[PDB]
Write a protein that binds this ligand. Sequence first.
Ligand SMILES: [Mg+2]
Ligand SMILES: [Mg+2]
Ligand SMILES: [Mg+2]
Ligand SMILES: [Mg+2]
Lengths: 390, 390, 390, 390
Amino acid sequence: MKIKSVRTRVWTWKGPTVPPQGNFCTNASDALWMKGDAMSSFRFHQWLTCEVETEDGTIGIGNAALAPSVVKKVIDDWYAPLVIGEDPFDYAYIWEKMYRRSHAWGRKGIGMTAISAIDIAIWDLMGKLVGKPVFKLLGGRTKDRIPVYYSKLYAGSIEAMQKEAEEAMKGGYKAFKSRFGYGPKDGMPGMRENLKRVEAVREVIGYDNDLMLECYMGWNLDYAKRMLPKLAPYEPRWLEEPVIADDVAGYAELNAMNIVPISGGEHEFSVIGCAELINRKAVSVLQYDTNRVGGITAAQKINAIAEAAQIPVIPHAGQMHNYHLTMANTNCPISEYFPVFDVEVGNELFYYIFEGDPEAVDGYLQLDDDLPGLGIAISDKHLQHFDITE
Amino acid sequence: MKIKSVRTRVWTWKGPTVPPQGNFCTNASDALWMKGDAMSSFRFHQWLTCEVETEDGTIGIGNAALAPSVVKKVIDDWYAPLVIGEDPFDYAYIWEKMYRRSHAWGRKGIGMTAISAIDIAIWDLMGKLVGKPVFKLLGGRTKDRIPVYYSKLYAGSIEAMQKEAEEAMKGGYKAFKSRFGYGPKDGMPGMRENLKRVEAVREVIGYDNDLMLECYMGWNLDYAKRMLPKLAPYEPRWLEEPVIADDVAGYAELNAMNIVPISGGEHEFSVIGCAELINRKAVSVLQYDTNRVGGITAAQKINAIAEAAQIPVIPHAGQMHNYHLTMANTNCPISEYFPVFDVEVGNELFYYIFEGDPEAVDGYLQLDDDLPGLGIAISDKHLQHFDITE
Amino acid sequence: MKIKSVRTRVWTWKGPTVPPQGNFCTNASDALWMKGDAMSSFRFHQWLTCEVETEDGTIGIGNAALAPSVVKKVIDDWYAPLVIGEDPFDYAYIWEKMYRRSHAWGRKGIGMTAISAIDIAIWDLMGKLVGKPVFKLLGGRTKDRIPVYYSKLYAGSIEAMQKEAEEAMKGGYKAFKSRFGYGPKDGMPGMRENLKRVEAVREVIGYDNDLMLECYMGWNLDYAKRMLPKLAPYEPRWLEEPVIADDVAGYAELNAMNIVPISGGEHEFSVIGCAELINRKAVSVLQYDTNRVGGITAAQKINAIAEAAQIPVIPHAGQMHNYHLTMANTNCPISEYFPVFDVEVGNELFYYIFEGDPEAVDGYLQLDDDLPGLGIAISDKHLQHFDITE
Amino acid sequence: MKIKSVRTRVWTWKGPTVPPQGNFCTNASDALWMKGDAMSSFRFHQWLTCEVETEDGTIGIGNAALAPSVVKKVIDDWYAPLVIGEDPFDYAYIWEKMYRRSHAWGRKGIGMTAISAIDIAIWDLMGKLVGKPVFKLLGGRTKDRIPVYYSKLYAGSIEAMQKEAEEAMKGGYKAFKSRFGYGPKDGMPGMRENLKRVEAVREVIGYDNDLMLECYMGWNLDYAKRMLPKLAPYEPRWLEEPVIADDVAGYAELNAMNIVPISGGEHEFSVIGCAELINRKAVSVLQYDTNRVGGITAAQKINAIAEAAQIPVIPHAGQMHNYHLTMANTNCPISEYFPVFDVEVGNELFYYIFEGDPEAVDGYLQLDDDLPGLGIAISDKHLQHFDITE
Ligand SMILES: [Mg+2]
Ligand SMILES: [Mg+2]
Ligand SMILES: [Mg+2]
Ligand SMILES: [Mg+2]
């Protein structure tokens, strides 16, 4: 049984969205002085689906969110030819072909993202071909159920943030992640605005629950080092992406301070790429997203490396392409969970494109031991809200 | 489909054997002053087979060579109960159950060896259950064929060693491994006896081929450091196990000298165990044996770690439990090949117990893309040469 | 005078026991999701006695608790032949014979445990042969009496834990060790349950006494790093085995943080094995158990290494095989003391098998300057509570 | 004066080319077992031109060779909008806008390549706007003329390689770079084939001239370490890209051996990206290509970092986008020079698209002190050999 085709489509949301607000989420563009929504270039109002079909009609479903139209071009023009005609079960070799043939320009970023979408599809395909859930092929059930942390709580008025925290608490979660809305340019006043909101969330979820904090590459080494001592009293479980992805040295410096655990990796690429974060102890928690880092083939290898180093792997984003990996490794304790929501930043956009991603129940997710593949299908429920290009 | 039983048997060779000779192979016992064959406690004239059967009668075949009778007792009394009743495809969880429940006493040695035999069996079983060769489940075909290095050439008279080298050359190999017969206790005279034999082998295979040298834990840090400069002129590809397995610090010191690459790992256990050798750069080439280190589940993870570090993995021993792993990873360039031979040290004993292990052709081995599992079966060809206990 | 025989027996308790309770003691199996008593595979309801007798009838008594039936098989089949016919006073050579001949599979775990039981017996034998207490042969009296810390206080209701602490205080101890009942899987709520119990014990013993905390390999690097800052206010003297034994790198990372001293080693094997923990500063306090690490011959060497590094040695378990070593070295300040108790976890099981182990008086233990050997004998007081297999 | 438009075109060569040959140039795809020309995915038979025009009609010319069609899409869809309407002299800010807004997916690879083409164009534009050569704006004339090393000598028959070397010598160069045609998979026989060709080139150019050796990511850490001692006798000035670009740790290990200087960087991206190679001493010579690494803005910063570390910068490729930078920094001693040639690998393709790149005279290149900008223009001499898409 050989692969016959690779169908890649870009889905562009054209339905209503939540209007952007200022001091909502710190980001890498804050350092500039551009007008408008600072999250503009980071929102996901587009998504990519990648369907790999074999001669017998079986179809595997992969996906990606980073620069969809460009990633699609890479898949169509460069990678599809390296995949078509191959046995899905030569997945490691197929992965290596893409990685090496395009090494000059694709080892990180666009290239690796395209590899990710294809690879995820190939795994869904393999699972379907042998009638096994992807997580079973990866090792099976290491957890009776997957705990998740509520991931949202963007910065806003104290009233709005506490209102959301109260609502989130009703979900039964024992961990919550909130975003900062102020950074370096805001100086000390901004530091106080940040601390006031960390405290506000703590007032609602209390100290019997975990609180993770998200910077989304919006701070820098200097500001982050000065914030750590101020954040420690609030006992955050981790501080995510305090610096831009290129500043790995900064990550290592911050993490070695042992004031507040540093997490990151959603913007790191390839097995070696993540292996470096692990070996250099750049992070206390690794958060690659399988649809960016290189796919399930790469993520499985990364999980082995992180497990040996005993650095927890908690993938970025709550989707089946991550849940299956987490289920199969003891060093993957919990998953990130983006609640179903209106199209805001876009992390929830996949809920409108796919059917099958589990929803949290009392703070836990579950996988089906018998459902082959990833257990997802492309949805036709919101076609009227999308402009799909092929 | 659940596992129904675990059948473990110890096969004891009672047929003719090659009489022991002195200064044949250096080993960890050389440091003592015991009489008799120095390789006595290291020979493999016994082997263990482990058959894991599911309710439908499908059987997976695993094996082990270290302390067979003791390993069998551990499997029968401790691990079998943790395996029976489980889904073979929860292999990572099954592995973790054994590893953690027995962590106090089994993380290395007897315990991990028992885990290895069971795990290998579970993988053969999974392959058969879904009709796929084990290497396909692990990643597929990364090589058109597997190159191998001829592994024998024990120390002896110059005439005998050169005669064997001439014969080995007819096999078409481009790499050969030879053993030393003199160590620390033999002082400088022994160093010269060693160098004379390295040179003798080189005279036959020439410098257009690779030559690996084996110490089998028979030297020590001191002697090895003094030998390195003397060996370098002969351009050996690597020096294997120059020190006892516990002396990891010694490994690291020797390897860091960058005079002759140091290899090892056949006596290291668990994923973390091998991860340490990799991270500490204790070896330039990692050589765990899948039927010792923790099985295919562990070996697959170790291969990911070694690949990211770019330290080649060339498993100890040439058997299907290693070949399949090697085939699926680009960082596994060649395999060790023990030629079919009379029962001498015992590394060739598995040829008398199993059918299916490929034989070298012009220095290469091949795997069948369609044969499910490991592609081996227990042989009934030499039952009269064994006393099998169950 | 030569050794004539080695008699090994496994004693299986069949008398009443204390029913298992949940959240009693964190352990390496907590990470799984198995049903039943989490301490099941760790309890010691069996014990091994090893009697080495010389031609003149003198008998030395050794023992071991890890996987008794398997350890016995190793002693009977592999090590006994290397010991019989030898002079007990060639103990270092006898030790080396076992260590090197079985190095491929016994350097840690089952093998080293078997070596331990035999070696301890050989020392008791030597002491009897020359009419000297073992501690005298090791260096003599470095302390007027041996201080001990009360070791029990498993996790339970606050009322039960404080009740035990009150009772323990009546013993006059100036140090107490308590176990955690919650770990990683319990998240922040579990962290609070842990802290509440640390505080509860502190409320009873106060701050004029020392409090040690035990994780028994039930936490992981991540969770432990996050707990350290929370534990510091309670001023614990040390945090024991926060990670599984294989994670030595984790030990080193945690210990280097200098927030709470990290202790460990009860699950480490051989002289080099412990030397690595010392050199890598993996622990602030080393706790090997002589009947696991390699016996008195190995423990004596380890004590020399730890003393030079000035890392206190406080052996795991309170038995004569440890007390004698502690008495002879200035760097061994106190001993662990398991109070005589009903058969619960099993650490107290040896009290039912041997006679002679000293009991604490006002927080101190004493050794007899004239009693030859270890000063113990096999007891016939509880034969009706055991099924002894030979 | 503001930027009005960004015109990006992809030029596809459709004229005659030199037929591919085996064992011509080692590369990252050699590790696979694909059929056909191993350099297929690495050849440059396409090129990209990027023209940035201001309101007054002044046009700056930039370019790129990596994945042209994809890079073009990124420029047209993502970066053009961030550039149009801006003052060319806010180049550092323009650069930062692109780098940060697209940081999630463009920090390396496609994204940074697109930034490179635009940035180079902006510099050519600035030079034209103020009537100054780009090198003057960067610091001026630090060298009376720029020495260059002849870069070609691909692997082939000894006769062909020596014939080319003889011809190259007539050019007056004092340095030459040659490529290997054998790698890891070829084993020792391949090592000898490599050494035979290094020696053959040395026989022609002698030892009064420098010889650099190119691996083009075709070897691995293992093979490279074993080759170093064998190459040293030939006194190569450096060994280029012995490992794939992701293996920075490997680079550092190899370079630290100090056997043969290691060079690399043509596949590294961004200022921080190259800063890491410098700080980690991954290379003895840094070779980024300005039309890949991030443009002249980034290259200028990288040159400052390399100069302080005293690690020579010798940019990959001989084109004006590199020559101007080299001319302005004392730590940039020589430039790589691809001779004008038929379309073979494609490194010479730019000669058919642009007019103005200087040609070597007796081993030196010269820049015009009065010619504004980069001193190049798009050529109409070979339009019939190209299919240009806009
Ligand atoms: Mg994040
Ligand atoms: Mg070996
Ligand atoms: Mg303990
Ligand atoms: Mg190059």
